[PDB]
Design a binder for this molecule. Structure first.
Ligand SMILES: CC(C)CCC[C@@H](C)[C@H]1CC[C@H]2[C@@H]3CC=C4C[C@@H](O)CC[C@]4(C)[C@H]3CC[C@]12C
Ligand SMILES: CC(C)CCC[C@@H](C)[C@H]1CC[C@H]2[C@@H]3CC=C4C[C@@H](O)CC[C@]4(C)[C@H]3CC[C@]12C
Ligand SMILES: CC(C)CCC[C@@H](C)[C@H]1CC[C@H]2[C@@H]3CC=C4C[C@@H](O)CC[C@]4(C)[C@H]3CC[C@]12C
Ligand SMILES: CC(C)CCC[C@@H](C)[C@H]1CC[C@H]2[C@@H]3CC=C4C[C@@H](O)CC[C@]4(C)[C@H]3CC[C@]12C
Ligand SMILES: CC(C)CCC[C@@H](C)[C@H]1CC[C@H]2[C@@H]3CC=C4C[C@@H](O)CC[C@]4(C)[C@H]3CC[C@]12C
Ligand SMILES: CCCCCCCCCCCCCCCC(=O)O
Ligand SMILES: CCCCCCCCCCCCCCCC(=O)O
Ligand SMILES: CCCCCCCCCCCCCCCC(=O)O
Ligand SMILES: CCCCCCCCCCCCCCCC(=O)O
Ligand SMILES: CCCCCCCCCCCCCCCC(=O)O
Ligand SMILES: CCCCCCCCCCCCCCCC(=O)O
Ligand SMILES: CCCCCCCCCCCCCCCC(=O)O
Lengths: 281, 227, 57, 39, 338, 126
């Protein structure tokens, strides 16, 4: 009937990677959440967008733990309702995470390129484009799975059925936008560096550092090795390990770089540590 | 009895919060500038082309700029210049040239650039009287500076055609005299933008517009810890 | 010949400030000590106040 | 059968569930071979 | 004609210095050895008033210890309620740069001034429901640095043209003028009986002016840099000055010299605002190292540290009953320490 | 009380040398960067030179470069200025001025009309 593959010894180990970094991602993200509950003098719009992105990563990782705990072949055989509920909630939080990375990219592009149009942005537009726009997409996906393909907890893939792409259609399109803006930003960054740096070595190093910091924020790590060619070979192992490491450590990298290595947040932590030292001493 | 007074104070607080939100939306759109210079610099033609303080409201491409000009004050500048700590730019206008004016301008720019509270505000430099430099070079810049004869013309910039080599040599010498004390202890938090202007020129407003755009872009790159 | 009037005003100001009777340092210090020690009971910043009398809690 | 990097979670879930199904299928075939050897 | 007058002035200064050395019996630190020290002062931030956009530059408490004004450089003068943290009033200003503000002892008028050289007096008798510019005082040739009310009719102002003035609110003319300084008069402090007032300038000197006579009484020169703030003792016989050389100095009016010098090795930041408590034991000093210090006025020992601000603390005020301390810094945040 | 006393001057021959002394009393000498500023008859004040707190950063005006020597003694509490190879243009009233703030580099109001942290000055006629 069927024959086992030689990549099986790899596969479970990759799952162990998904059990490692996601856990320490919480050890970043929730802690970062507490920072945005304490520091009230940092309430500009940029920190609000970053805090909403951290909340989206927290909800996605918590729903991912729920997914990895409540799935079994006995639940996969018979189509139960809460299985479809957990699948729809995970897809909703994933689309919400991508639209908040879109909000990060739109705010950064409207902060650097359209410099004089930065005050036109308001908080309610980003809230309604982050938490609002995924709702009709997930409702349309639920209707399409209710009427076309309603087997195997709505995530079983049948050939000739393209009902999954109705939630994957805009996302990669969003990801396309998250490429293009970044390119323009890098151009403007060069327009600063050549003005401010007299050494070729320093400016390229700072541009590479800014690019490697900005890549996990906009989520362009998914576009690094995106489509498998299709041949049953060792490229599937590279696909699984590369995408598993990036999807597990993306939220950790975003949280650490934008919270713990920021100068204002470190200065506020040093001020509060001196206040606690003066109180205890 | 106290419930009605508390409800009246809550309604007054809601009205004042709505008015302050509208005033915040008005306030964060306008960009404010500080025009500063000497007496013989020629700021009158500058304010005619584009009381204690002088107000100037204008707009370019639907972007409101409010310029503040210091008027009936004294020479004691060490107490009120701390008030201009949240402006986006200090437009420092001096004229190239009686007492020595350029050394006083260099000392004033050195005191502004090395101030404790003026480490975040960028200075847009303007050299106003270039025609006076072209007229006074024919029949006094070599007397006050002994390093004017032992100075080479910078080749990294393109000079305007139809001019004497001594005029552009003195121009870039004054530019390098400002950039020596400008590029000494800057450390990337605040920058200087030297420019060359004349009397009848309407291209200065676009220069101030582009320089303030560069200042806000460098501020947003500083807040993201990219630059 | 413009600062001569300012010099005359400074001379007259020093002559007005010269003829005074300066009180001793120890007597004024004891007066400030007695004033600071007498009003020590009604200082809400020196002595910590309870939650009832404090309107800011 | 194209897959995407974004849908990596459900891809790993489908591979793990298909591996569990073929493992249970091999276990049931082993039990059936025990029944055939006994009876 | 100048050499003889300068030598006569030097001889008179030498006579004043010899008289001050002859009247100096003993220091205060030698006789305050048997005094019980204060100890650790723990003041927490009870209320936090966040309604300003630009930097809060000045504030003043009311007579009823409940309402307080706060002026910012965005063009706002907000009258806050300290108990129920509600905004009672918000006055938009004509000139956006305002360096000082005042509150009436009766609670009816509010003054403000800045770089426009005009003292604007607003009335809080809202017959129509909205506040309006009740008066404008324009007779100074320099920036208005500080202003305080004597009563509902008179107002003492200090300007940056080395002059102080006494204005009548009804007529609009200077009653008397004060011209004895050579630098910018940074601040002034009225006496509790409203008879005399001190004024410190940028020549490291504080002069004691009379309101009724209109001439200087005494001069105090004990600092090394610009005197930024001054405040009276609660009885009205001594005062304390804060300067830019990170040293505070408590002077006496009767002894005509300094009594105490407050300094420390780690403090290299100038003082912005000084204010005593109600009794006179604690002395509050707002430095430029993002925190305030509570000194013991009798033993010169730093008792407390008020560290809750992010930027330069510009204004500090103590209410009349001594219940709380309002500090306002350049991060647009008022904090009510208690 | 802050007091600055100047010493030296007098009518000398052109091309000769001279030495000005500045005695300070009433403050800490090792905290303030100090300046020499001259005022010509019939003209305004103009800045001559300055020395920092430690004495490492010494700067001059271009018209007085290589001919003036400004030094300071923190223990002896004094400020010296050696002037060799003079010119008949240097006849002025000289002042030793103090910057108003300690532990800083900026000096705003040194060359001003009414500044109180400078001495009475000395007359040098060449
Ligand atoms: C249980 C295992 C994973 C160890 C967890 C360590 C946790 C409990 C520790 C380590 C780092 C700590 C944080 C360090 C800094 C701050 C900023 C402060 O303003 C709020 C508390 C907060 C957020 C601390 C909360 C407790 C904390 C999160
Ligand atoms: C916002 C998202 C995370 C909400 C997800 C709802 C989750 C937390 C709830 C809703 C239905 C719940 C399930 C209800 C029934 C069962 C059957 C039991 O034998 C195992 C637990 C399990 C499977 C529960 C697990 C938790 C569960 C899946
Ligand atoms: C709005 C976003 C979060 C998507 C929500 C999807 C979930 C909560 C909703 C949308 C469609 C709903 C389904 C509609 C029809 C049926 C058939 C019924 O015999 C069993 C329940 C079941 C299967 C419902 C279960 C819950 C359901 C799957
Ligand atoms: C899909 C099911 C299982 C879970 C759905 C969770 C939804 C209902 C919850 C979780 C997170 C919530 C959002 C959290 C934050 C905000 C910002 C606030 O200013 C407006 C409401 C808003 C936008 C909430 C709307 C409701 C919300 C989106
Ligand atoms: C460095 C960060 C991004 C983590 C990336 C881990 C990568 C570099 C490592 C971890 C697991 C490794 C794989 C382990 C096993 C194999 C099978 C072998 O026949 C080909 C190489 C290959 C496919 C390795 C390629 C490199 C690899 C994917
Ligand atoms: C901190 C690093 C965590 C991630 C590290 C992942 C590395 C996994 C490598 C597994 C190699 C297995 C090779 C098996 C060879 C075979 O039998 O086919
Ligand atoms: C595990 C915790 C999950 C929390 C999910 C809900 C997140 C709520 C986010 C609230 C955003 C509010 C933005 C405005 C903040 C403000 O300036 O007051
Ligand atoms: C806002 C909507 C929230 C929806 C929460 C879940 C409601 C639908 C759950 C469907 C469970 C179906 C279980 C089997 C049906 C049955 O036979 O009883
Ligand atoms: C911004 C719009 C993005 C939406 C993309 C629309 C294309 C959806 C493709 C799948 C639609 C459902 C197809 C069901 C299978 C069928 O063809 O019968
Ligand atoms: C306009 C939005 C673009 C979003 C991209 C979504 C991609 C949808 C692809 C649908 C392909 C349908 C082809 C069916 C062919 C067939 O019948 O076999
Ligand atoms: C934006 C989408 C781009 C998609 C690009 C897909 C490129 C696929 C390349 C596959 C190469 C596989 C090589 C395997 C070599 C090996 O056996 O190790
Ligand atoms: C090697 C991976 C470790 C993962 C650790 C996750 C939690 C990190 C917490 C860091 C808190 C930093 C707080 C500020 C430190 C400081 O600069 O004073």
């Amino acid at each position: 009937l069927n024959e086992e593959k030689k990549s099986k010894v790899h596969y479970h180990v990759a799952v162990i990677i998904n059990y490692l970094g996601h856990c320490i991602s919480l050890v970043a993200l929730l802690v970062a959440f507490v920072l945005f509950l304490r520091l009230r003098s940092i309430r500009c719009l940029r920190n609000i967008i970053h805090w909403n992105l951290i909340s989206a990563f927290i909800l996605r990782n918590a729903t991912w733990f729920v997914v990895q705990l409540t799935m079994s072949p006995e639940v996969h055989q018979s189509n139960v309702g809460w299985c479809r509920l957990v699948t729809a909630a995970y897809n909703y939080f994933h689309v919400t995470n991508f639209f908040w990375m879109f909000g990060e990219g739109c705010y950064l592009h409207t902060a650097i390129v359209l410099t004089y149009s930065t005050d036109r942005l308001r908080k309610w537009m980003f809230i309604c484009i982050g938490w609002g726009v995924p709702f009709p997409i997930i409702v349309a996906w639920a209707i399409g799975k209710l009427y076309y393909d309603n087997e195997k907890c709505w995530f079983g893939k049948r050939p000739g059925v393209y009902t999954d792409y109705i939630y994957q259609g805009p996302m990669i399109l969003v990801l396309l936008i998250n490429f293009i803006f970044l390119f323009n930003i890098v151009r403007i960054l060069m327009t600063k560096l050549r003005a401010s740096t007299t050494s070729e070595t320093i400016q390229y190093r700072k541009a590479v550092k800014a690019t490697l910091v900005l890549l996990p924020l906009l989520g362009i790590t998914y576009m690094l090795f995106f489509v498998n060619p299709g041949e049953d070979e060792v490229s599937r192992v590279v696909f699984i390990y590369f995408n598993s490491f990036l999807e597990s450590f993306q939220g950790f990298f975003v949280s650490v770089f934008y919270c713990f290595l920021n100068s204002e947040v470190r200065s506020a932590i040093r001020k509060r540590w001196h206040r606690w030292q003066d109180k205890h001493s | 009895d106290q419930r009605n007074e508390e409800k009246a104070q809550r309604e007054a607080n809601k009205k004042i919060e709505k008015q302050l939100q509208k005033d915040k939306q008005v306030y964060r759109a306008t960009h404010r500038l500080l025009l500063l210079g000497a007496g013989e610099s020629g700021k009158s033609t500058i304010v005619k082309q584009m009381t204690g303080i002088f107000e100037t409201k204008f707009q370019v491409d639907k972007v409101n700029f409010h310029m503040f000009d210091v008027g009936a004050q004294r020479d004691e500048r060490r107490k009120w210049i701390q008030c201009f700590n949240d402006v986006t730019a200090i437009i420092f206008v001096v004229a190239s040239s009686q007492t020595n004016r350029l050394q006083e301008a260099l000392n004033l720019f050195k005191s502004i650039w090395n101030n404790r509270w003026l480490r975040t505000i960028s200075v847009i430099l303007f050299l106003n009287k270039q025609d006076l430099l072209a007229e006074k070079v024919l029949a006094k810049i070599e007397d006050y500076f002994p390093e004017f004869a032992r100075y080479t013309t910078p080749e990294d910039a393109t000079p305007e055609p139809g001019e004497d080599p001594r005029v552009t040599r003195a121009k870039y010498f004054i530019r390098d005299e400002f950039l020596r004390i400008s590029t000494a202890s800057g450390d990337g938090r605040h920058y200087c933008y030297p420019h060359f202007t004349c009397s009848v020129d309407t291209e200065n407003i676009r220069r101030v517009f582009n320089d303030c755009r560069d200042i806000i872009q460098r501020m947003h790159l500083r807040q993201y810890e990219l630059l | 010949t413009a600062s001569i009037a300012q010099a005359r005003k400074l001379v007259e100001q020093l002559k007005m400030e010269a003829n005074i009777d300066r009180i001793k340092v120890s007597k004024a210090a004891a007066d400030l000590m007695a004033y600071c020690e007498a009003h020590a009971k009604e200082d809400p910043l020196l002595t910590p106040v309870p939650a009832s009398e404090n309107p800011f809690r | 059968n194209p897959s995407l990097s974004i849908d990596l979670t459900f891809h790993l879930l489908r591979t793990l569930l298909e591996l569990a199904r073929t493992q249970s299928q091999r276990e049931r075939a082993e039990q059936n071979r025990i029944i055939f050897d006994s009876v | 004609e100048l050499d003889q007058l300068r030598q006569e002035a030097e001889q008179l200064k030498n006579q004043i210095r010899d008289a001050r050395k002859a009247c100096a019996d003993a220091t205060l630190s030698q006789i305050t050895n048997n005094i019980d020290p204060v100890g650790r002062i723990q003041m927490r931030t009870r209320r936090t008033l966040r309604g300003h956009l630009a930097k809060i530059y000045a504030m003043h408490w009311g007579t009823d210890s409940r309402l307080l004004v706060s002026a910012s450089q965005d063009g706002k003068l907000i009258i806050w309620d300290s108990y129920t943290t509600n905004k009672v009033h918000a006055i938009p200003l004509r000139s956006s740069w305002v360096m000082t503000c005042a509150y009436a002892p009766s609670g009816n008028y509010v003054a403000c001034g800045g770089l426009d050289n005009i003292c604007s007096i607003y009335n809080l008798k809202t017959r129509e429901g909205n506040v309006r510019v009740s008066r404008e005082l324009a007779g100074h040739t320099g920036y208005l640095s500080c202003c305080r009310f004597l009563d509902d009719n008179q107002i003492v102002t200090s300007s940056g043209d080395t002059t102080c003035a006494l204005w009548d609110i009804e007529t609009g003319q200077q009653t008397t003028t004060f011209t004895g300084h050579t630098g910018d008069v940074m601040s002034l402090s009225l006496a509790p009986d409203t008879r005399l007032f001190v004024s410190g300038a940028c020549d490291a000197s504080a002069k004691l002016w009379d309101v009724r006579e209109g001439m200087c009484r005494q001069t105090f020169t004990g600092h090394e840099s610009d005197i930024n703030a001054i405040c009276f003792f609660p009885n009205g016989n001594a005062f304390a000055t804060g300067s830019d050389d990170a040293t505070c100095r408590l002077f006496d009016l009767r002894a005509d010299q300094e009594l105490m010098t407050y300094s420390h090795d780690n403090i290299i930041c100038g003082i912005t605002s000084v204010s005593f408590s109600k009794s006179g034991r604690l002395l509050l000093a707002g430095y430029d190292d993002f925190n305030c210090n509570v000194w013991d006025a009798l033993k010169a020992d730093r008792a407390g540290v008020l560290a809750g601000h992010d930027n330069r603390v510009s204004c500090l005020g103590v209410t009349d009953d001594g219940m709380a301390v309002a500090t306002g810094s350049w991060d647009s945040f008022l904090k009510i320490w208690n | 009380q802050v007091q600055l006393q100047e010493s030296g001057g007098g009518l000398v021959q052109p091309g000769g040398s001279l030495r000005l002394s500045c005695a300070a009393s009433g403050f800490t000498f090792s905290n303030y960067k100090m300046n020499w500023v001259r005022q010509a008859p019939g003209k305004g004040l103009e800045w001559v030179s300055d020395i920092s707190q430690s004495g490492a950063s010494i700067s001059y005006t271009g018209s007085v470069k290589g001919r003036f020597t400004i030094s300071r003694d923190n223990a002896k509490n004094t400020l010296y200025l050696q002037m060799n190879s003079l010119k008949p243009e240097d006849t002025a009233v000289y002042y030793c001025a103090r910057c108003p703030a300690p532990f800083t580099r900026d000096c705003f109001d040194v060359t001003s009309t009414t500044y109180a942290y400078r001495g009475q000055g000395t007359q040098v006629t060449v």
